[PDB]
Amino acid sequence: NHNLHITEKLEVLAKAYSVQGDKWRALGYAKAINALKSFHKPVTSYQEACSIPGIGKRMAEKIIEILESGHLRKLDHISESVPVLELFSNIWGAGTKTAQMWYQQGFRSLEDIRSQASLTTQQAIGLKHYSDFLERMPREEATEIEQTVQKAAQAFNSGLLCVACGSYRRGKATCGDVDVLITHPDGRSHRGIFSRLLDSLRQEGFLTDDLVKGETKYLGVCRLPGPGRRHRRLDIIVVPYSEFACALLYFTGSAHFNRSMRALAKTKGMSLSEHALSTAVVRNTHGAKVGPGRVLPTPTEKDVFRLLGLPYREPAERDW
DNA sequence: CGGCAGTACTG
DNA sequence: CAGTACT
DNA sequence: GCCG
Ligand SMILES: [Mg+2]
Ligand code: NA
Ligand code: NA
Ligand code: NA
Ligand code: NA
């Protein structure tokens, strides 16, 4: 990163807008920050600032203040509420609206939340694991978690395919959580496995708490056995084999990679989701789907790239 | 002016 | 529905 | 916040 002196300051503002609910302004900052990290050389001129996609007049102005004075005065006017709003929205299940409500109600610490706040089932689990969920795990531990799910799944049906996606598949040395995708090549026998799989994972205490228990998605909490283990976030998605490539692409990410690819698809009259790549998608002027279109055959991830006119990228070069 | 990705789940 | 979450 |  040629421009840490700039991005470190912008990241503070980005996070401030995010926790206060100003999601589109925060998005613009996040995109400018990534663009700046991608640039080869230091940004040295306002003219060079606007040069970059994602950098407008306002962002170029802030870059020029930083280079000339080494500071951004805007940082000095960030609301005193922001560190508390960040503290609260780092509880799993609490976002900007819940954080702002707790702040308005006078809560300033997790002790206040613990002792006085009305918590959802999800949020009580988030609070109970507050520290652990802010920690990453070594890639090796993610391997052990993936293998634990796979062995439980294959005990029911040897034919089930299980793959750890997210940052693991993108090759990262550490992982925030584990993202396991499950399917069956026979196109049918992925159905109804959750009850048995999850109960199997419960029985010797690997699965410690459930956050979401849907027909397709599980989100919860696990812990490997033995001393020195922390609780880890675990997500499981079960999909029919017909959707495997698009589900794999979705679940491998990154989030910004997916958003960029989906935006591209929309420009080409197509729609990309974890279910399918569709074409002849009829939308309105608001960019919203009014006609479904046709699902395009995507047996592999490479087929999705090809149909979008893009060269294939291995998971490691999707880490946007 | 207005989209900024597209979807699942909760209560 | 609004909110929060996932990549 | 940026961009078409
Ligand atoms: Mg993940
Ligand atoms: Na620009
Ligand atoms: Na949260
Ligand atoms: Na009180
Ligand atoms: Na996850």
mmCIF file of C-alpha atoms (C1' of nucleotides) and ligand atoms in Angstrom:
data_model
loop_
_atom_site.group_PDB
_atom_site.id
_atom_site.type_symbol
_atom_site.label_atom_id
_atom_site.label_comp_id
_atom_site.label_asym_id
_atom_site.label_seq_id
_atom_site.Cartn_x
_atom_site.Cartn_y
_atom_site.Cartn_z
ATOM 1 C CA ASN A 1 0.000 0.000 0.000
ATOM 2 C CA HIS A 2 1.590 3.197 -1.387
ATOM 3 C CA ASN A 3 -0.880 5.376 0.513
ATOM 4 C CA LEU A 4 -1.194 4.157 4.104
ATOM 5 C CA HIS A 5 -0.783 7.746 5.343
ATOM 6 C CA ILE A 6 -4.032 8.492 3.501
ATOM 7 C CA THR A 7 -6.048 5.302 3.904
ATOM 8 C CA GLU A 8 -5.469 4.974 7.654
ATOM 9 C CA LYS A 9 -7.209 8.314 8.160
ATOM 10 C CA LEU A 10 -9.996 7.597 5.667
ATOM 11 C CA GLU A 11 -10.700 4.239 7.323
ATOM 12 C CA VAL A 12 -11.493 6.068 10.579
ATOM 13 C CA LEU A 13 -14.148 8.142 8.802
ATOM 14 C CA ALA A 14 -15.461 5.136 6.903
ATOM 15 C CA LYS A 15 -16.041 3.228 10.138
ATOM 16 C CA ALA A 16 -17.632 6.267 11.750
ATOM 17 C CA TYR A 17 -20.148 6.669 8.940
ATOM 18 C CA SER A 18 -20.810 2.913 8.970
ATOM 19 C CA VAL A 19 -21.619 2.534 12.664
ATOM 20 C CA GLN A 20 -23.831 5.665 12.482
ATOM 21 C CA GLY A 21 -25.934 4.095 9.704
ATOM 22 C CA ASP A 22 -24.761 6.201 6.745
ATOM 23 C CA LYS A 23 -24.220 3.117 4.662
ATOM 24 C CA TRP A 24 -23.856 4.657 1.191
ATOM 25 C CA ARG A 25 -21.348 7.273 2.316
ATOM 26 C CA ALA A 26 -19.428 4.492 4.080
ATOM 27 C CA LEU A 27 -19.533 2.445 0.876
ATOM 28 C CA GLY A 28 -17.994 5.308 -1.083
ATOM 29 C CA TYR A 29 -15.188 5.556 1.450
ATOM 30 C CA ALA A 30 -14.602 1.806 1.425
ATOM 31 C CA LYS A 31 -14.285 1.860 -2.363
ATOM 32 C CA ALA A 32 -11.948 4.875 -2.390
ATOM 33 C CA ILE A 33 -9.782 3.191 0.243
ATOM 34 C CA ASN A 34 -9.457 0.027 -1.836
ATOM 35 C CA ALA A 35 -8.673 2.021 -4.975
ATOM 36 C CA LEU A 36 -5.958 3.867 -3.040
ATOM 37 C CA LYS A 37 -4.467 0.625 -1.732
ATOM 38 C CA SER A 38 -4.366 -0.694 -5.315
ATOM 39 C CA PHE A 39 -2.527 2.298 -6.795
ATOM 40 C CA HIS A 40 1.139 1.718 -7.540
ATOM 41 C CA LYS A 41 2.774 4.965 -6.394
ATOM 42 C CA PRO A 42 1.873 7.437 -3.664
ATOM 43 C CA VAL A 43 -0.840 9.871 -4.718
ATOM 44 C CA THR A 44 0.953 13.224 -4.984
ATOM 45 C CA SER A 45 -1.440 15.546 -6.840
ATOM 46 C CA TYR A 46 -5.111 16.476 -6.776
ATOM 47 C CA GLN A 47 -4.999 15.928 -10.552
ATOM 48 C CA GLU A 48 -3.643 12.450 -9.898
ATOM 49 C CA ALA A 49 -6.284 11.934 -7.216
ATOM 50 C CA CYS A 50 -9.279 12.377 -9.520
ATOM 51 C CA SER A 51 -7.317 10.173 -11.948
ATOM 52 C CA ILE A 52 -8.300 7.134 -9.896
ATOM 53 C CA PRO A 53 -11.669 5.370 -10.273
ATOM 54 C CA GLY A 54 -13.455 5.753 -6.967
ATOM 55 C CA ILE A 55 -11.889 9.148 -6.162
ATOM 56 C CA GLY A 56 -14.025 12.248 -6.698
ATOM 57 C CA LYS A 57 -13.660 15.946 -5.967
ATOM 58 C CA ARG A 58 -14.495 15.483 -2.286
ATOM 59 C CA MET A 59 -12.069 12.587 -1.801
ATOM 60 C CA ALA A 60 -9.307 14.336 -3.769
ATOM 61 C CA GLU A 61 -9.779 17.353 -1.490
ATOM 62 C CA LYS A 62 -9.285 15.191 1.604
ATOM 63 C CA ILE A 63 -6.186 13.612 0.089
ATOM 64 C CA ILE A 64 -4.697 17.053 -0.580
ATOM 65 C CA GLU A 65 -5.317 18.159 3.016
ATOM 66 C CA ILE A 66 -3.531 15.043 4.293
ATOM 67 C CA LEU A 67 -0.475 15.386 2.086
ATOM 68 C CA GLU A 68 -0.043 19.117 2.796
ATOM 69 C CA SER A 69 -0.783 19.097 6.553
ATOM 70 C CA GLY A 70 -0.381 15.443 7.538
ATOM 71 C CA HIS A 71 -3.886 15.499 9.019
ATOM 72 C CA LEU A 72 -7.609 15.574 8.257
ATOM 73 C CA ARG A 73 -9.541 18.033 10.410
ATOM 74 C CA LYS A 74 -12.772 16.076 9.842
ATOM 75 C CA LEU A 75 -11.337 13.457 12.196
ATOM 76 C CA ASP A 76 -11.535 15.977 15.037
ATOM 77 C CA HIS A 77 -15.331 16.277 14.761
ATOM 78 C CA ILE A 78 -16.303 12.607 14.866
ATOM 79 C CA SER A 79 -19.085 12.141 17.397
ATOM 80 C CA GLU A 80 -18.093 10.861 20.836
ATOM 81 C CA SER A 81 -20.823 8.246 20.378
ATOM 82 C CA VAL A 82 -18.871 6.415 17.677
ATOM 83 C CA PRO A 83 -16.609 4.216 19.891
ATOM 84 C CA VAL A 84 -19.666 3.057 21.866
ATOM 85 C CA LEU A 85 -21.690 2.424 18.710
ATOM 86 C CA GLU A 86 -18.767 0.336 17.447
ATOM 87 C CA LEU A 87 -18.589 -1.542 20.763
ATOM 88 C CA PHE A 88 -22.298 -2.362 20.583
ATOM 89 C CA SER A 89 -22.466 -3.257 16.868
ATOM 90 C CA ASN A 90 -19.654 -5.742 17.361
ATOM 91 C CA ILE A 91 -22.224 -7.890 19.243
ATOM 92 C CA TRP A 92 -23.371 -10.494 16.732
ATOM 93 C CA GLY A 93 -27.031 -9.776 15.991
ATOM 94 C CA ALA A 94 -26.852 -6.052 16.826
ATOM 95 C CA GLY A 95 -26.354 -3.585 14.034
ATOM 96 C CA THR A 96 -26.467 0.167 13.637
ATOM 97 C CA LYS A 97 -30.135 0.543 14.573
ATOM 98 C CA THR A 98 -29.843 -1.497 17.780
ATOM 99 C CA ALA A 99 -26.592 0.227 18.716
ATOM 100 C CA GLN A 100 -28.125 3.697 18.239
ATOM 101 C CA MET A 101 -31.199 2.679 20.241
ATOM 102 C CA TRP A 102 -29.066 1.412 23.147
ATOM 103 C CA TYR A 103 -26.987 4.604 23.018
ATOM 104 C CA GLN A 104 -30.119 6.794 23.058
ATOM 105 C CA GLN A 105 -31.363 4.779 26.033
ATOM 106 C CA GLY A 106 -28.196 5.633 27.966
ATOM 107 C CA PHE A 107 -26.120 2.459 27.598
ATOM 108 C CA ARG A 108 -22.402 3.051 27.288
ATOM 109 C CA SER A 109 -20.655 -0.275 28.078
ATOM 110 C CA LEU A 110 -21.134 -3.991 27.674
ATOM 111 C CA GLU A 111 -21.767 -4.099 31.432
ATOM 112 C CA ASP A 112 -24.751 -1.811 30.796
ATOM 113 C CA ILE A 113 -25.919 -4.133 27.992
ATOM 114 C CA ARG A 114 -25.448 -7.262 30.135
ATOM 115 C CA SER A 115 -27.268 -5.848 33.115
ATOM 116 C CA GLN A 116 -30.025 -3.742 31.521
ATOM 117 C CA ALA A 117 -30.576 -4.355 27.807
ATOM 118 C CA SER A 118 -33.285 -6.542 26.294
ATOM 119 C CA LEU A 119 -31.331 -8.939 24.087
ATOM 120 C CA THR A 120 -32.555 -11.193 21.360
ATOM 121 C CA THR A 121 -31.614 -14.847 21.535
ATOM 122 C CA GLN A 122 -28.974 -14.172 18.876
ATOM 123 C CA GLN A 123 -27.552 -11.128 20.657
ATOM 124 C CA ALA A 124 -27.209 -12.941 23.991
ATOM 125 C CA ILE A 125 -25.070 -15.578 22.199
ATOM 126 C CA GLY A 126 -23.090 -12.807 20.507
ATOM 127 C CA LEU A 127 -22.448 -11.090 23.830
ATOM 128 C CA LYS A 128 -21.440 -14.390 25.509
ATOM 129 C CA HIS A 129 -18.787 -14.830 22.764
ATOM 130 C CA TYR A 130 -17.910 -11.156 22.321
ATOM 131 C CA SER A 131 -14.133 -11.511 22.479
ATOM 132 C CA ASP A 132 -13.926 -14.860 20.671
ATOM 133 C CA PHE A 133 -15.923 -13.619 17.692
ATOM 134 C CA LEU A 134 -13.507 -10.701 17.173
ATOM 135 C CA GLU A 135 -10.539 -13.098 16.935
ATOM 136 C CA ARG A 136 -9.343 -14.934 13.895
ATOM 137 C CA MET A 137 -8.218 -18.551 13.846
ATOM 138 C CA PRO A 138 -5.208 -20.115 12.151
ATOM 139 C CA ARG A 139 -5.973 -21.729 8.829
ATOM 140 C CA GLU A 140 -5.111 -25.128 10.351
ATOM 141 C CA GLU A 141 -7.976 -24.784 12.834
ATOM 142 C CA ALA A 142 -10.381 -23.953 10.022
ATOM 143 C CA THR A 143 -9.176 -27.181 8.394
ATOM 144 C CA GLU A 144 -10.014 -29.129 11.548
ATOM 145 C CA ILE A 145 -13.484 -27.543 11.707
ATOM 146 C CA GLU A 146 -14.189 -28.295 7.995
ATOM 147 C CA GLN A 147 -13.043 -31.885 8.510
ATOM 148 C CA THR A 148 -15.295 -32.240 11.595
ATOM 149 C CA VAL A 149 -18.378 -31.233 9.566
ATOM 150 C CA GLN A 150 -17.360 -33.421 6.641
ATOM 151 C CA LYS A 151 -16.881 -36.532 8.756
ATOM 152 C CA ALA A 152 -20.278 -35.981 10.403
ATOM 153 C CA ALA A 153 -21.895 -35.481 6.987
ATOM 154 C CA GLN A 154 -20.204 -38.431 5.295
ATOM 155 C CA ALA A 155 -21.300 -40.724 8.139
ATOM 156 C CA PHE A 156 -24.883 -40.214 6.915
ATOM 157 C CA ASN A 157 -24.109 -40.351 3.187
ATOM 158 C CA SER A 158 -20.588 -41.047 1.924
ATOM 159 C CA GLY A 159 -21.590 -39.249 -1.289
ATOM 160 C CA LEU A 160 -21.999 -35.801 0.255
ATOM 161 C CA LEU A 161 -19.421 -33.232 -0.869
ATOM 162 C CA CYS A 162 -18.303 -30.676 1.745
ATOM 163 C CA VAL A 163 -16.063 -27.686 0.976
ATOM 164 C CA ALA A 164 -14.793 -24.853 3.165
ATOM 165 C CA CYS A 165 -15.263 -21.581 1.290
ATOM 166 C CA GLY A 166 -14.810 -17.926 2.404
ATOM 167 C CA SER A 167 -11.320 -16.747 3.313
ATOM 168 C CA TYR A 168 -10.202 -20.369 3.727
ATOM 169 C CA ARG A 169 -10.719 -21.190 0.064
ATOM 170 C CA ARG A 170 -9.191 -17.876 -0.933
ATOM 171 C CA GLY A 171 -5.992 -19.141 0.768
ATOM 172 C CA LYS A 172 -5.734 -16.815 3.783
ATOM 173 C CA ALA A 173 -3.373 -17.677 6.628
ATOM 174 C CA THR A 174 -6.063 -16.858 9.223
ATOM 175 C CA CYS A 175 -9.874 -17.030 9.035
ATOM 176 C CA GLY A 176 -12.558 -15.029 10.814
ATOM 177 C CA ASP A 177 -15.024 -17.931 10.659
ATOM 178 C CA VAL A 178 -15.580 -21.174 8.755
ATOM 179 C CA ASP A 179 -17.934 -21.373 5.751
ATOM 180 C CA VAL A 180 -18.871 -24.972 4.753
ATOM 181 C CA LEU A 181 -20.836 -25.713 1.558
ATOM 182 C CA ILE A 182 -22.518 -29.120 1.228
ATOM 183 C CA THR A 183 -24.146 -30.775 -1.776
ATOM 184 C CA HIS A 184 -24.693 -34.200 -3.359
ATOM 185 C CA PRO A 185 -23.884 -35.071 -7.004
ATOM 186 C CA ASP A 186 -27.053 -37.189 -7.252
ATOM 187 C CA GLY A 187 -29.106 -33.983 -7.161
ATOM 188 C CA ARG A 188 -31.495 -35.267 -4.482
ATOM 189 C CA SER A 189 -29.836 -36.614 -1.375
ATOM 190 C CA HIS A 190 -28.793 -33.255 0.064
ATOM 191 C CA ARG A 191 -32.443 -32.985 1.130
ATOM 192 C CA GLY A 192 -33.432 -33.064 4.787
ATOM 193 C CA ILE A 193 -29.954 -33.735 6.141
ATOM 194 C CA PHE A 194 -29.788 -30.774 8.544
ATOM 195 C CA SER A 195 -31.662 -32.393 11.424
ATOM 196 C CA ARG A 196 -29.337 -35.374 11.529
ATOM 197 C CA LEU A 197 -26.150 -33.474 10.695
ATOM 198 C CA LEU A 198 -26.676 -30.799 13.340
ATOM 199 C CA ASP A 199 -27.799 -33.294 15.965
ATOM 200 C CA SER A 200 -24.700 -35.336 15.141
ATOM 201 C CA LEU A 201 -22.504 -32.276 15.611
ATOM 202 C CA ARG A 202 -24.225 -31.556 18.945
ATOM 203 C CA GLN A 203 -23.815 -34.906 20.566
ATOM 204 C CA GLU A 204 -20.191 -34.671 21.792
ATOM 205 C CA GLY A 205 -20.426 -30.909 22.175
ATOM 206 C CA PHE A 206 -18.826 -29.514 19.009
ATOM 207 C CA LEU A 207 -21.840 -27.336 18.155
ATOM 208 C CA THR A 208 -22.346 -25.064 21.183
ATOM 209 C CA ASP A 209 -25.034 -22.569 20.078
ATOM 210 C CA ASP A 210 -27.296 -21.923 17.089
ATOM 211 C CA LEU A 211 -27.865 -18.438 15.638
ATOM 212 C CA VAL A 212 -29.805 -19.268 12.464
ATOM 213 C CA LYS A 213 -31.466 -22.644 11.574
ATOM 214 C CA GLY A 214 -32.964 -22.312 8.086
ATOM 215 C CA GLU A 215 -33.940 -24.869 5.486
ATOM 216 C CA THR A 216 -30.794 -24.023 3.505
ATOM 217 C CA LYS A 217 -28.489 -22.069 5.872
ATOM 218 C CA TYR A 218 -27.133 -22.777 9.329
ATOM 219 C CA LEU A 219 -25.182 -20.155 11.280
ATOM 220 C CA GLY A 220 -23.824 -21.029 14.681
ATOM 221 C CA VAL A 221 -20.976 -21.606 17.060
ATOM 222 C CA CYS A 222 -18.578 -24.490 17.505
ATOM 223 C CA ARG A 223 -15.561 -25.400 19.601
ATOM 224 C CA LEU A 224 -12.999 -28.135 19.047
ATOM 225 C CA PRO A 225 -12.174 -30.392 22.009
ATOM 226 C CA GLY A 226 -9.256 -30.109 24.402
ATOM 227 C CA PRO A 227 -7.603 -27.209 26.233
ATOM 228 C CA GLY A 228 -6.750 -23.872 24.698
ATOM 229 C CA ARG A 229 -9.717 -23.822 22.337
ATOM 230 C CA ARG A 230 -11.901 -20.829 21.546
ATOM 231 C CA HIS A 231 -15.471 -20.711 20.285
ATOM 232 C CA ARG A 232 -15.611 -20.151 16.528
ATOM 233 C CA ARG A 233 -18.302 -19.017 14.104
ATOM 234 C CA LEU A 234 -19.415 -21.792 11.730
ATOM 235 C CA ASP A 235 -21.788 -21.418 8.766
ATOM 236 C CA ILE A 236 -23.145 -24.354 6.761
ATOM 237 C CA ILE A 237 -25.094 -24.070 3.486
ATOM 238 C CA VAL A 238 -26.730 -27.099 1.831
ATOM 239 C CA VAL A 239 -27.550 -26.676 -1.869
ATOM 240 C CA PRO A 240 -28.805 -28.865 -4.711
ATOM 241 C CA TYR A 241 -26.082 -29.930 -7.101
ATOM 242 C CA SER A 242 -27.606 -27.856 -9.937
ATOM 243 C CA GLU A 243 -26.644 -24.706 -7.994
ATOM 244 C CA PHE A 244 -23.179 -25.882 -6.893
ATOM 245 C CA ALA A 245 -21.024 -23.631 -9.067
ATOM 246 C CA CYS A 246 -22.959 -20.462 -8.252
ATOM 247 C CA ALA A 247 -23.135 -21.366 -4.548
ATOM 248 C CA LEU A 248 -19.392 -22.061 -4.492
ATOM 249 C CA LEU A 249 -18.694 -18.737 -6.220
ATOM 250 C CA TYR A 250 -20.943 -16.871 -3.789
ATOM 251 C CA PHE A 251 -19.621 -18.524 -0.631
ATOM 252 C CA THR A 252 -15.940 -18.144 -1.658
ATOM 253 C CA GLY A 253 -16.294 -14.372 -2.141
ATOM 254 C CA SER A 254 -14.840 -12.039 -1.254
ATOM 255 C CA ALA A 255 -17.929 -9.883 -0.548
ATOM 256 C CA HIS A 256 -16.545 -7.025 -2.643
ATOM 257 C CA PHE A 257 -15.633 -9.495 -5.400
ATOM 258 C CA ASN A 258 -19.222 -10.788 -5.443
ATOM 259 C CA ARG A 259 -20.727 -7.305 -5.503
ATOM 260 C CA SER A 260 -18.453 -6.266 -8.370
ATOM 261 C CA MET A 261 -19.278 -9.393 -10.366
ATOM 262 C CA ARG A 262 -23.033 -9.046 -9.743
ATOM 263 C CA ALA A 263 -22.898 -5.370 -10.771
ATOM 264 C CA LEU A 264 -21.119 -6.400 -13.975
ATOM 265 C CA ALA A 265 -23.764 -9.021 -14.709
ATOM 266 C CA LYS A 266 -26.524 -6.425 -14.340
ATOM 267 C CA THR A 267 -24.858 -4.184 -16.933
ATOM 268 C CA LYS A 268 -24.952 -7.137 -19.351
ATOM 269 C CA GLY A 269 -28.670 -7.775 -18.880
ATOM 270 C CA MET A 270 -27.951 -10.692 -16.545
ATOM 271 C CA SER A 271 -28.378 -11.458 -12.853
ATOM 272 C CA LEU A 272 -25.984 -13.376 -10.632
ATOM 273 C CA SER A 273 -26.927 -14.950 -7.331
ATOM 274 C CA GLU A 274 -25.876 -17.923 -5.226
ATOM 275 C CA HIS A 275 -28.623 -19.856 -7.032
ATOM 276 C CA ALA A 276 -27.886 -19.085 -10.675
ATOM 277 C CA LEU A 277 -26.614 -16.878 -13.448
ATOM 278 C CA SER A 278 -29.674 -15.710 -15.399
ATOM 279 C CA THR A 279 -29.999 -13.759 -18.671
ATOM 280 C CA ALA A 280 -32.720 -11.835 -20.454
ATOM 281 C CA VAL A 281 -33.407 -10.529 -16.950
ATOM 282 C CA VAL A 282 -36.056 -7.841 -17.369
ATOM 283 C CA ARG A 283 -35.717 -5.009 -14.841
ATOM 284 C CA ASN A 284 -37.187 -1.539 -14.304
ATOM 285 C CA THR A 285 -35.471 1.863 -14.387
ATOM 286 C CA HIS A 286 -34.755 1.415 -10.649
ATOM 287 C CA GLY A 287 -32.515 -1.579 -11.398
ATOM 288 C CA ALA A 288 -35.062 -3.966 -9.856
ATOM 289 C CA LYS A 289 -36.088 -7.300 -11.371
ATOM 290 C CA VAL A 290 -39.560 -7.295 -12.933
ATOM 291 C CA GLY A 291 -39.003 -10.283 -15.253
ATOM 292 C CA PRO A 292 -37.145 -13.446 -14.256
ATOM 293 C CA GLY A 293 -35.191 -14.329 -17.370
ATOM 294 C CA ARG A 294 -33.590 -17.656 -18.170
ATOM 295 C CA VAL A 295 -31.196 -19.576 -15.950
ATOM 296 C CA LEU A 296 -27.945 -20.212 -17.820
ATOM 297 C CA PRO A 297 -26.171 -23.565 -17.405
ATOM 298 C CA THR A 298 -23.196 -23.165 -15.066
ATOM 299 C CA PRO A 299 -21.774 -26.607 -14.206
ATOM 300 C CA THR A 300 -18.498 -24.986 -13.054
ATOM 301 C CA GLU A 301 -17.256 -21.651 -11.724
ATOM 302 C CA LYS A 302 -15.301 -21.211 -14.965
ATOM 303 C CA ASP A 303 -18.634 -21.212 -16.812
ATOM 304 C CA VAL A 304 -19.849 -18.197 -14.813
ATOM 305 C CA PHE A 305 -16.769 -16.164 -15.732
ATOM 306 C CA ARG A 306 -16.996 -17.262 -19.369
ATOM 307 C CA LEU A 307 -20.658 -16.288 -19.710
ATOM 308 C CA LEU A 308 -19.852 -12.865 -18.217
ATOM 309 C CA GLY A 309 -17.017 -12.365 -20.713
ATOM 310 C CA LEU A 310 -14.357 -12.422 -17.953
ATOM 311 C CA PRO A 311 -11.124 -14.416 -17.611
ATOM 312 C CA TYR A 312 -11.239 -17.026 -14.873
ATOM 313 C CA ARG A 313 -9.817 -16.059 -11.482
ATOM 314 C CA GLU A 314 -8.679 -18.647 -8.970
ATOM 315 C CA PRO A 315 -10.064 -18.135 -5.434
ATOM 316 C CA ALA A 316 -6.815 -16.487 -4.293
ATOM 317 C CA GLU A 317 -7.225 -13.698 -6.754
ATOM 318 C CA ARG A 318 -10.766 -12.932 -5.608
ATOM 319 C CA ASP A 319 -9.565 -11.538 -2.277
ATOM 320 C CA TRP A 320 -10.858 -8.039 -2.907
ATOM 321 C "C1'" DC B 1 -31.342 12.090 -10.095
ATOM 322 C "C1'" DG B 2 -30.677 8.046 -8.028
ATOM 323 C "C1'" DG B 3 -28.289 3.276 -7.754
ATOM 324 C "C1'" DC B 4 -24.656 1.647 -5.176
ATOM 325 C "C1'" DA B 5 -25.713 -7.095 -5.156
ATOM 326 C "C1'" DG B 6 -28.645 -10.383 -4.220
ATOM 327 C "C1'" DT B 7 -30.231 -13.261 -1.151
ATOM 328 C "C1'" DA B 8 -31.791 -15.855 3.818
ATOM 329 C "C1'" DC B 9 -33.646 -15.607 8.267
ATOM 330 C "C1'" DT B 10 -35.938 -13.592 12.458
ATOM 331 C "C1'" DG B 11 -39.879 -11.890 15.085
ATOM 332 C "C1'" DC C 1 -42.245 -5.442 7.266
ATOM 333 C "C1'" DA C 2 -37.225 -3.641 9.431
ATOM 334 C "C1'" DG C 3 -33.195 -5.270 10.879
ATOM 335 C "C1'" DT C 4 -29.217 -8.097 10.547
ATOM 336 C "C1'" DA C 5 -26.584 -11.234 8.423
ATOM 337 C "C1'" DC C 6 -23.744 -13.929 4.612
ATOM 338 C "C1'" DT C 7 -20.205 -13.872 0.590
ATOM 339 C "C1'" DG D 1 -18.952 9.165 -0.477
ATOM 340 C "C1'" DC D 2 -18.660 7.972 -6.298
ATOM 341 C "C1'" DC D 3 -20.423 7.519 -10.791
ATOM 342 C "C1'" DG D 4 -23.487 6.967 -15.075
HETATM 343 MG MG MG E 1 -16.315 -16.316 6.295
HETATM 344 NA NA NA E 2 -12.136 9.420 -10.518
HETATM 345 NA NA NA E 3 -23.192 -6.930 15.085
HETATM 346 NA NA NA E 4 -29.986 2.522 34.204
HETATM 347 NA NA NA E 5 -19.517 -17.056 7.674
#
